[PDB]
Amino acid sequence: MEAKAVARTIRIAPRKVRLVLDLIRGKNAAEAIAILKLTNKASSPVIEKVLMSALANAEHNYDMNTDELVVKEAYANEGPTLKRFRPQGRASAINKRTSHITIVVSDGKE
């Protein structure tokens, strides 16, 4: 039923992206893809790329009925942050975060 795909350690915060992903939680691909091509952040095209491969999986492998596919679930969690600096004449620091993204997509059934 469920296909799945996952983005590994992506250079965005979950605080950055939880919002964009808190919309499609319980929807269809069609509306969802449209929304991704519609609204304007940098999360969008990536998430879209993800789903296109997710359904490449679901169809090439499991061969299910696309339009009847709804969002099963999808979210993300933290990842391996890195660290950088600010010159300033004396020391100063910062941290660059990442993200672990998951989408599971079902034909809404078993």
Partner 1 sequence: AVPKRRTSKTRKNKRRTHFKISVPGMTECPNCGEYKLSHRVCKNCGSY
Partner RNA sequence: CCGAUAGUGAACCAGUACCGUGAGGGAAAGGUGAAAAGCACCCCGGAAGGGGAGUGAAAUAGAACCUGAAACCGUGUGCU
Partner RNA sequence: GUAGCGAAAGACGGGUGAGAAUCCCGUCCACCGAUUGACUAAGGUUUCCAGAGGAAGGCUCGUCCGCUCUGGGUUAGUCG
Q: How far is the CB of 54 from RNA (least distance, A)?
A: 7
Q: How far is the CB of 68 from RNA (least distance, A)?
A: 19
**Which one of 63, 77, 90, 110 is in contact with RNA (CB under 7 A)?**
77
DSSP sequence for 20-85 = HHTSSTT-BHHHHHHHHHHS-SSHHHHHHHHHHHHHHHIIIII---STT-EEEEEEEE----EEEE
Which residues contact RNA (rule: CB under 7 A)? 3-8, 11, 13-16, 18, 22, 25, 49, 52-53, 56-57, 59-61, 73, 75-78, 82, 84, 86-89, 96
